[PDB]
Amino acid sequence: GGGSVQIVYKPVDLS
Amino acid sequence: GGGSVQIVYKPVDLS
Amino acid sequence: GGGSVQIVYKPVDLS
Amino acid sequence: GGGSVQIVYKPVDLS
Amino acid sequence: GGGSVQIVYKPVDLS
Amino acid sequence: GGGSVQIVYKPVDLS
Amino acid sequence: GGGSVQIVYKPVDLS
Amino acid sequence: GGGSVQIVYKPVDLS
Amino acid sequence: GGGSVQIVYKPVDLS
Amino acid sequence: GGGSVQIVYKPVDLS
Amino acid sequence: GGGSVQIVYKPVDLS
Amino acid sequence: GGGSVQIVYKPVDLS
Amino acid sequence: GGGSVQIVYKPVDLS
Amino acid sequence: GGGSVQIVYKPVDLS
Amino acid sequence: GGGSVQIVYKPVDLS
Amino acid sequence: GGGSVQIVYKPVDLS
């Protein structure tokens, strides 16, 4: 098994 | 198995 | 097997 | 097992 | 603008 | 604008 | 098990 | 601009 | 178990 | 501008 | 068990 | 500009 | 400029 | 236990 | 410029 | 200039 990449991406735009 | 990429992408737009 | 890409994409638009 | 990369990315834009 | 995800995925099988 | 996902996917099979 | 990299990344832009 | 994720993913399977 | 790298990265931009 | 994440991921599987 | 590296990185830009 | 994260990830599996 | 994080991650699994 | 490294890094840039 | 973090992480697993 | 942090991390697991 060649490993793992996990990404949680949650940009928030205000005003 | 050549590895793995997982992405959770949840942009939120407010006002 | 050449690995894997998994994406969950859930944009939310508010007000 | 080829290790693991985990990223939480939450940019915030204000005013 | 809720950001961007860009992915280049080029699996190679040899021999 | 709910962001953007862009993927370039080019698997190669040799020999 | 080849270890682990964990990143929490939260840039803040104000005014 | 809500930031950016860029990924280059090039798994190689040999012999 | 090949150890562990943990990073908290929170850059802040003012004025 | 909410920063940037760049990843180069190149697992190699041998014998 | 190969230990641990923990980093808290919080650069501040003013004026 | 909210900084930058760069990762080079190259797991190797042998025998 | 909000600084920089650079990581080179190369786990090696043998025998 | 292979020990521990902990780093708190907070550069502040003024004028 | 808010400084810099550079990490070279190379865990090795034997026998 | 906000300085620099450089880390070389090479844990070795045997028997």
Per-position DSSP letters for I1-15, written without gaps between them: ----EEEEE--EE--
Interface C:E, ≥3 CB–CB pairs < 8 Å: yes
Q: In what order do the strands lie in the sheet with J5-9?
A: F5-9, E5-9, H5-9, J5-9, L5-9, M5-9, O5-9, P5-9
Contact between residue M1 and residue N9 where contact means Cβ atoms under 8 Å apart = no
How many residues does this entry show for chain O?
Answer: 15
Experimental method: cryo-EM
Closest-CA residue to G5 (of O10, J3, N10): O10
Rounded CA separation G13/J9 (Å) = 29
Contacts for M15 with CB less than 8 Å, ≥ 6 apart: L14, L15, O14, O15
Distance from CA of D12 to the nearest CA of H (A): 7
Chain F nearest CA to C11, separation (Å):
5
On whether the CB atoms of residues E7 and F6 are closer than 8 A, the answer is yes
SS3 of residue L2 by DSSP: coil
The two tokens of residue N5 are 């490294």
**Residue recorded with tokens 């995925």:** E9
What whole-number distance in Å separates Cα of residue G10 and Cα of residue D11?
A: 5
